Design an enzyme around this catalytic site. Structure first.
Site, PDB file in Angstrom:
ATOM      1  N   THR A  11       0.852  -1.220   0.000  1.00 14.66           N
ATOM      2  CA  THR A  11       0.000   0.000   0.000  1.00 14.66           C
ATOM      3  C   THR A  11       0.869   1.244   0.000  1.00 14.66           C
ATOM      4  O   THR A  11       1.968   1.234   0.540  1.00 14.66           O
ATOM      5  CB  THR A  11      -0.930   0.038   1.220  1.00 14.66           C
ATOM      6  OG1 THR A  11      -1.833  -1.071   1.170  1.00 14.66           O
ATOM      7  CG2 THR A  11      -1.722   1.331   1.247  1.00 14.66           C
ATOM      8  N   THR A  12       0.386   2.308  -0.629  1.00 16.56           N
ATOM      9  CA  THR A  12       1.052   3.599  -0.594  1.00 16.56           C
ATOM     10  C   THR A  12      -0.003   4.688  -0.577  1.00 16.56           C
ATOM     11  O   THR A  12      -0.836   4.761  -1.484  1.00 16.56           O
ATOM     12  CB  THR A  12       1.975   3.790  -1.796  1.00 16.56           C
ATOM     13  OG1 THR A  12       2.860   2.671  -1.897  1.00 16.56           O
ATOM     14  CG2 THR A  12       2.797   5.052  -1.635  1.00 16.56           C
TER      15      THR A  12
END
Lengths: 203, 203, 194, 202, 201, 218, 181, 181, 194, 201
Positions: free
Chosen positions: E1-2
């Site tokens: 995730t970012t």
């Protein structure tokens, strides 16, 4: 899992009188992608070997098999065939069985005398898996298994074989976190080998 | 895996399924699990052949099944199997527990399907089985393992070793799990895959 | 810890941190984490305390032995191959060398700079820019953004300045700056005004 | 293994009927996808007992909804939100027609509406093929040099049936836990249609 | 995730990827990682936010003014600390706060700041934001900066990718500037910028 | 630590057959030989249980409580409002899931519904339930099901399976189980629940016709 | 397993059940547990070292003459529970036991295996010195039948080997014969 | 421990050894292990819950009248191995055993404790329905003496409680008496 | 991590690090690790991520509640006693506040500065100078050398500069400087030019 | 334990404490923690040095030259790395090296430097040296600096104390500048400097 550290996938398929072998180009330290140029497919004449698993072991086995096939060619005055090379790979993996290499090899080639396709894989038990249709290896083996099992049909022409294997590799790589950053497909014929780089998701 | 050995009135028959599994995934749908140790000694499980052949050449005698059993159990003890065959002393059917212990049997079963196969063997095995009855019985036990066990599937391999004659190996004796034809052809039109580079490889 | 390398048009630029930390305190803030393997090959190394220098000196001794024996300067490609063999053999030995290395060299026969990244497992890979451990987690995005194969040594030094500033800004530890060495056709030199 | 696909005024939710423990087959026909009425089809796979409990509690909740709203047809989004708030080691998928009459597939809290979604053991074998064949991923118009992607046309319910059958046939071929029969429930403006197709029993 | 959120002269830019994975299996490439708590509050995650939205609706009914970003982030941080590996930004605008970003994580920390990146690809997003961020970015420049920052992490981080969902938080609420497929975005960025030179193609 | 192993059953054209051995094993010691593990709950239901015997007795208590409480203020409890196999199964599954302090058992509830449909379902300590033309529990799930499934491979085989065929199949499965199961006994109980004849409960059956003569050659 | 060696007036009778189990599953129900390590020396277990001991005993027989039962027990001990029973004209029928500790005990009768635990009192109350062959056989039958009745890991047919100056006589008893006892 | 309850023609005899051990050390060599939980109901653990069961049984006797031996076993079970032996003129002598599993088994005779393992075969062959008092006493003496002879954690004097319509009779047998059996 | 305090003739000087680090990256480099409990009392706190601010805000709420209730500024001695009670109770509760605090105050009734050091266990101690965690392992040797009860605020600030320079020199991690606040008879003020 | 060695214009000052403890029990307050390997080499520890001294004797017999500090430190570092919690300084003078300090540690590290402090009290010794050290210290000032640094460590570190043993390594060999009891030295320093103001008395 040492094989899962670097990721990557190899797939080999049989066409009509021709063979295809394909792999992704990503080399990574687990989540981190390091290189997009780590080709996992090597050839020792007219026989091709795709090695997935721990990248250090991939390099070590490439060096070892280059050594062994060079000596074989010098002594025998003939190039090693796909079946003889499959046996050589199987015996070489066994010689290190206790403290094994964390690799899954895929042999692909055309026997020069009979002139007919050959592909083989090697499982954890070390059993040679010589297949008439396709061999898959790597982290996305499940994705590849389903994809190839749905797309493959017998006696593909080389131009259809390319499309089938490239779609199988691209769609399996898209669904594998540790695979991608480009793909290369070899189409191996009696007379020539065509190497192609595929456009694909760079994430 | 499902392996059964069935001794009958003039010999012994061993059979196996042809499914190899990587956990829940079927890696090889047609794995050959019956292995020659010598022409009339075969084994199946869930170096020895070469040494047996060398000793046969040295002594100029037909291998004993007891010789293979002894060598194999000593090899496993140094570092399951069914070994069955015919030698000048008759037909034999041994099992080896890979920690070193061995036993004689008139019918045996090994693998994850061992219980399902043993149910059929117990239900239907009898003294003085004819060759055809024994082949039918071994095939039925393997089929029970195939249908009832998730680790067993695909086809039935049978090897029949009768005392007075040579061993007959029946590769894919039954093929009850042949795949149906797909609803559609998934042939891509040529040009579906996007290619970056094309090159000819100097093999 | 911090080992960075960038290959530019004419040279290879290697940067390495100066700090040496044993437990609770920084023992040294001027350590040089590079060995000159050859007049035109330079090896940076990082990892656990003793292994790094032991492996570096062992490699340097063997490479100098080869050079003297053959009266010939081993190419960076061959030096990196030897280093990879030594790491890949030790990883399945009784006591591995837990050492990560960047080998930056100028190949005088091909007249090209070369940079190789090798991890303690023996994973050799020839790169345009490299970084070992967590240092790559910050610098790779900047390098992907700004790197061009045609940069001059000045532009590569500016890009290393940017990478080192990013590491200083975001990475928690104080690595006390970097020592920057340039490998070129003229040999190895050190940038002091960095 | 369950599979939901939304399409042009239809949705399908399919799953294999095999039930297993370890390496042994418990039953070859244990229906896994349930027609819940109100033109909603649902399946709660994963751990069996928690799935059963979730289905039972959701049926209780929808009965209370019918009570308070005078037997109004429960909308697919209302059912999805209810299923969240009820949420078990379960991976639920519900399919139906949205208020606009379009096929809708909801995958589960943290519900996500998606054009298609697979779940279960063999989701990895099935889903990539469906991406390729439904969403036309990695396919380009021939002769465009990879510049023009293959347009995302809609598949008729016939073509989706073919795709589901072939996906589950392949998963049956290569997954030991998959395949004794294929149960397909089609949701359309007419109602919920149930189809059963045989799969290999080994 | 970012996920990243940064404040500039034009409000807040919130950019996230779309990928979700179960180990190496990519479960989905279209997950929504931003929750729209209010027309003026965005919750970025890398049940909780349903609870927060319910509390915000109750506050809207009870009190005369909208719930503050500080209050919402404090609610979330208190709830998380009660059940103390997750990181969230509560991004929003209030007339008496201006644009505000509060970072909250599973450890219970709560930080007001200008820039935050969260998730496995956070370092790669920081590498781009820190070097290209200015307070006086135009709205177009800031949107491109967020898109590029998520693109960097998606390229280098294996568990980040899918697509970039851009959000813009202004005085009049948040604006959804759409979804960008990282597959198309990477190549478009590569030709227009000339970056990613190491990538063949 | 006191447990019982074997419960096997199959449905046939007119009802269900279920059998179990009368043994309670204290680990490796064949301690108790009179344990009854088939629990009739009416002319239409039998509950075969395996696993911990203490929980088996607890479940028997609960079933008798069901039969008692159903008759309260219920004049039709005898014929029309009597307990169905399905009501008993759902009650038992609810009990198991509530305790799951799980009850360390596996239960096969077999019977015939009031409308004549054969009921045969499974439930265990985890609350996992399933139905099949043939059910078996414990070690029988591996040896007995292959034998019973040769008689009824699928649903369509049930109407073609007569009373005597299923009976002999169940007897042969008990003989095989006694051959190959170490924690099994020669003595077993058998219950037929036919839709016509009703519950036909046989006790103290003998595993017979065992073959040992071939041992002399080995 | 349930093995039982009993010296009697004319020699030694060594008997055992025929069940071997892997967990609750009976891997083999007709196994022959009596192992002939030398002409008149038979042993039991409660296989590889049995071959090694046969090897060493043949080597000893070649170099030094016929080994005694004490010789076989000694060979087992130096290679290492075991019951070693044998017969010769000088020592007559002999029984040695080598429990898990590795010590060697000469006994009039020995019992081993999980089934032995259940028949310690029975064998203690029923054994008599210098029984006849019929009495010894009946004693072993009753003891092993009780051990089989109680021990889950014991069962099948009862096999006996009778060692005497006359030769080696092998007996077998089926459950129809001894369970009714 | 080595406890043994046996129903016989006139009632039930409950008997046990007197040895208690903590490791190899004999903490008490004259313990009385037979516990009177109610007038004609005696139990034998194989202490606090025994008091609780006596409490509940007195409460039951006050409310609902004289409890049965099954009532006593039920109270043990609902509070929870135990051998519960008792007598009443309606049911005569009864024996219940509650092994560690927690299940209750009504039996003609029961043996428990570590010593019971060694006499499973002996008691099986020697037990007989409706023995006389003298025969039952001799049976228990022999069984417990063998259990003592084999079980290290069992020994000391043998105690018996004879329950009958006539009354409760306590017996003691010393090693000088039973070890020679 | 870094929490320092020095009591001088006329004031208490508290210094605290600015960095906030979660895992791989420094999230913030301007964090203020102090709460004003009172117009003349200031509390610096250090410890694990979430406990510190929760505990500090709980203490601030309770101290302000006491002050409003009694219309009277609690003395630093009483504030530190309350903080010690809260820490000592929580440590033998189900979830301790694993937090270390320095409480610097000016006692208006006694017209003297006061500095108290309290660790998560509840170990209150009144000190001339204090430091929590590993920060004291470096600063105490300088403070023992140079501290005098008669120093003016300027001398105390110079001694804090010395201590902070030592911490920067020898301590491995980078704490991004310190925020320095002075507690005095005139109230609390921040030294910006530190 | 606390040991320090620093180089200045006058050679090397080596100062060590004397305390040895077994847990909280102070076994000895007179342990010699400096090994006199040669008239020109000092080993400092916080068997090995017996081997090193024997090797130095053998070297001085074989070759004309005295063993270099680099060679001795690398002998010890190889020896330690072969058996890889300890830290030593090899301090000495050689005409073709000058004053040299090599720090060796149990991990196989080997560092040449101007200042090193080792042991549980090293942080306090650093706090004093780093702030008072100069290259151009007089021999008297450098000796006092070493004594004061060990005094600081002994005061604040529980496992450091006993007495301070001062060594001075000059061009003509090492000089033992005596043993100073930390008990007397602490007071003497307190009156002469006016430091340790917090200590009553």
């Amino acid at each position: 899992d040492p094989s899962s550290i670097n990721g990557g996938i190899v797939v080999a398929m049989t066409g009509k009188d021709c063979v295809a072998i394909a792999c992704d180009l990503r080399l990574g330290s687990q989540s981190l992608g390091v290189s997009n140029k780590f080709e996992k497919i090597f050839h020792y004449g007219h026989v091709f070997l795709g090695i997935t698993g721990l990248a250090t072991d991939v390099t070590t086995l490439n060096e070892m098999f280059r050594y062994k096939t060079n000596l074989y060619k010098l002594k025998e005055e003939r190039a090693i065939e796909p079946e003889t090379f499959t046996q050589l790979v199987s015996s070489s993996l066994y010689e290190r069985r206790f403290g094994p290499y964390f690799v899954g090899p895929v042999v692909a080639g055309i026997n020069s005398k009979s002139g007919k396709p050959f592909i083989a894989g090697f499982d954890l038990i070390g059993c040679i898996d010589e297949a008439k249709d396709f061999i898959v290896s790597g982290t996305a083996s499940d994705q590849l298994f389903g994809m190839c099992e749905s797309l493959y049909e017998p006696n593909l022409e080389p131009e259809d074989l390319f499309e089938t294997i490239s779609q199988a590799l691209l769609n399996a790589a898209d669904r594998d976190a540790l695979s991608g950053w480009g793909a290369v497909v070899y189409i191996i014929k009696k007379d020539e080998v065509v190497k192609r780089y595929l456009k694909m998701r760079q994430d | 895996t499902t392996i059964v050995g069935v001794k009958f009135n003039n010999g012994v028959v061993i059979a196996a399924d042809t499914r190899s599994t990587q956990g829940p995934i079927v890696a090889d749908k047609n794995c050959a699990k019956l292995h020659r140790i010598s022409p009339k000694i075969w084994c199946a499980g869930a170096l020895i052949g070469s040494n047996i052949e060398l000793h046969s050449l040295y002594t100029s005698r037909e291998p004993r099944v007891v010789s293979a059993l002894q060598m194999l159990k000593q090899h496993l003890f140094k570092y399951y199997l069914i070994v069955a065959g015919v030698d000048p002393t008759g037909s034999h059917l041994f099992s080896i527990h890979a920690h070193g212990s061995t036993d004689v049997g008139y019918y045996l079963s090994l693998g994850s399907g061992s219980l399902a196969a043993m149910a059929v063997l117990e239900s239907h095995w009898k003294q003085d089985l004819t060759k055809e009855e024994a082949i039918k019985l071994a095939s039925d036990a393997i089929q029970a393992g195939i249908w009832n066990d998730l680790g067993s599937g695909s086809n039935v391999d049978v090897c029949v070793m009768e005392i007075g004659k040579d061993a007959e190996y029946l590769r894919n004796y039954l093929t009850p799990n042949v795949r149906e034809e797909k609803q559609k052809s998934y042939k891509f039109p040529r040009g579906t895959t996007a290619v970056l580079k094309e090159s000819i490889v100097n093999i | 810890d911090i080992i960075l390398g960038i290959r530019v048009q004419d040279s290879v630029i290697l940067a390495s941190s100066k700090a040496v930390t044993r437990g609770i305190s920084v023992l040294k803030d001027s350590d040089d984490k590079t060995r000159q393997l050859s007049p035109h090959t330079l090896m940076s190394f990082a990892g656990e305390a003793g292994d790094t220098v032991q492996f570096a000196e062992y490699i340097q001794a063997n490479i100098q032995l080869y050079s003297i024996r053959e009266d010939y300067e081993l190419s960076p490609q061959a030096v990196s191959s030897f280093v990879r063999q030594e790491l890949a053999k030790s990883i399945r030995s009784r006591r591995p060398y837990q050492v990560n290395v960047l080998i930056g060299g100028y190949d005088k026969k091909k007249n090209k700079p070369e940079l190789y990244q090798i991890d303690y497992l023996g994973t050799k890979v020839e790169l345009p820019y490299g970084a070992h451990g967590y240092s790559g987690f910050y610098t790779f995005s900047l390098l992907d953004h700004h790197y061009r194969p045609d940069m001059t040594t000045e532009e590569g030094l500016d890009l290393l300045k940017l990478c080192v500033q990013e590491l200083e800004k975001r990475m928690p530890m104080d690595f006390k700056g970097v020592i920057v060495k340039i490998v070129d056709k003229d040999g190895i030199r050190q940038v002091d005004d960095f | 293994t369950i599979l939901g696909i939304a399409g042009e005024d239809f949705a399908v939710l399919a799953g294999d009927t095999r039930n297993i423990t370890d390496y042994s087959i418990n039953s070859r026909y244990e229906p896994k996808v349930f027609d819940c009425g109100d033109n909603i089809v649902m399946s709660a796979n994963g751990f069996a007992a928690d799935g059963d409990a979730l289905v039972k509690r959701f049926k209780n909740s929808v009965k209370w909804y019918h009570f308070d709203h005078n037997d109004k047809k429960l909308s697919i989004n209302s059912a999805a939100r209810n299923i969240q708030h009820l949420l078990y080691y379960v991976h639920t998928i519900i399919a139906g027609l949205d208020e606009d009459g379009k096929g809708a597939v909801y995958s589960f809290g943290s519900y996500e509406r998606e054009q298609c979604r697979a779940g279960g053991a063999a989701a990895s074998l099935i889903m990539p093929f469906l991406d390729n064949q439904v969403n036309f991923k990695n396919q380009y118009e021939p002769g465009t040099n990879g510049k023009v992607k293959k347009p995302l046309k809609y598949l008729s319910v016939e073509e989706v049936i073919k795709l589901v059958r072939d996906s589950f046939t392949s998963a049956t071929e290569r997954h030991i836990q998959v395949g004794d029969g294929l149960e397909i429930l089609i949701v359309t403006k007419d109602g919920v249609r149930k189809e059963f197709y045989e799969l290999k029993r080994d | 995730t970012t996920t990243l959120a940064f404040r500039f002269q034009g409000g807040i830019i919130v950019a996230v990827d779309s990928r979700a994975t179960a180990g190496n299996w990519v479960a989905s490439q279209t997950v929504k990682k931003v929750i729209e708590i209010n027309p003026f509050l965005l919750g970025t995650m890398a049940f909780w936010e349903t609870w927060l939205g319910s509390q915000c609706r109750l506050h809207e009914l009870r009190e005369k003014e909208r719930i503050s970003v500080a209050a919402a982030s404090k609610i979330l941080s208190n709830l998380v600390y009660q059940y103390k590996s997750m990181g969230t930004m509560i991004c929003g605008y209030t007339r008496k706060e201006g644009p505000t970003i509060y970072y909250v994580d599973s450890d219970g920390t709560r930080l007001k700041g200008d820039i935050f990146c969260v998730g496995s690809g956070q370092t790669f997003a920081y590498g781009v934001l820190d070097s290209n961020y200015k307070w006086d970015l135009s709205v177009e420049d800031a949107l491109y900066l967020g898109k590029r920052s998520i693109l960097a992490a998606a390229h280098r981080d294996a568990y980040s990718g899918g697509s970039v969902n851009l959000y813009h938080v202004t005085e009049d609420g948040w604006i959804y500037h759409g979804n960008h497929d990282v597959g198309e975005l990477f190549w478009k960025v590569k030709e227009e910028e000339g970056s990613f030179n190491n990538v063949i193609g | 630590i006191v447990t019982g192993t074997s419960v096997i059953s199959m449905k046939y054209d007119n009802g269900v057959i279920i059998a179990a051995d009368n043994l309670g094993s204290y680990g490796s010691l064949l301690r108790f030989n009179g344990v009854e593990r088939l629990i009739p709950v009416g002319d239409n239901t039998v509950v075969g249980i395996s696993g911990d015997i203490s929980d088996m007795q607890h479940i028997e208590r609960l079933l008798k409580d069901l039969v008692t409480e159903n008759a309260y203020d219920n004049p039709l409890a005898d014929a029309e409002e009597a307990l169905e196999p399905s009501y008993i199964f759902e009650y038992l599954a609810t009990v198991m899931y509530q305790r799951r302090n799980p009850l360390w058992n596996a239960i096969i509830v077999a019977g015939v519904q009031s409308n004549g449909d054969q009921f045969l379902r499974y439930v265990n300590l985890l609350g996992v339930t399933y139905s099949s033309p043939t059910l078996a529990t414990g070690f029988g799930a591996h040896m007995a099901n292959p034998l019973l499934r040769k008689v009824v491979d699928r649903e369509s085989d049930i109407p073609k399976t007569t009373v005597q065929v299923a009976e002999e199949a169940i007897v042969n499965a008990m003989r095989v189980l006694y051959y190959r199961d170490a924690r099994s006994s020669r003595n077993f109980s058998l219950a037929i629940i036919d839709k016509n004849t009703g519950l036909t409960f046989k006790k103290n059956l003998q595993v017979e016709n065992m073959k040992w003569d071939f041992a002399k050659d080995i | 397993t349930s093995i039982m060696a009993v010296t009697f007036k004319d020699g030694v009778i060594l008997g055992a059940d025929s069940r071997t189990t892997t967990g609750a599953y009976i891997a083999n129900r007709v196994t022959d547990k009596l192992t002939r390590v030398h002409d008149k020396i038979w042993c039991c277990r409660s296989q590889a070292i049995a071959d090694i001991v046969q090897y060493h005993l043949e080597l000893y027989t070649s170099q030094y003459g016929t080994p005694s039962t004490e010789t076989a027990a000694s060979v087992f001990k130096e290679l290492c529970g075991i019951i070693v029973a044998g017969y010769d004209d000088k020592n007559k029928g002999e029984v040695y036991t080598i429990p898990l500790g590795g010590s060697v005990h000469k006994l009039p009768y020995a019992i081993a295996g999980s089934g032995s635990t259940f028949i310690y009192g029975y064998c203690d109350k029923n054994f008599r010195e210098n029984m006849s062959k019929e009495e010894t056989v009946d004693f072993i039958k009753h003891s092993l039948s009780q051990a089989i009745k109680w021990d889950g890991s014991s069962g099948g047919v009862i096999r006996m080997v009778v060692l005497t100056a006359a030769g080696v006589e092998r007996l077998i008893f089926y459950p129809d014969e001894y369970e009714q006892l």
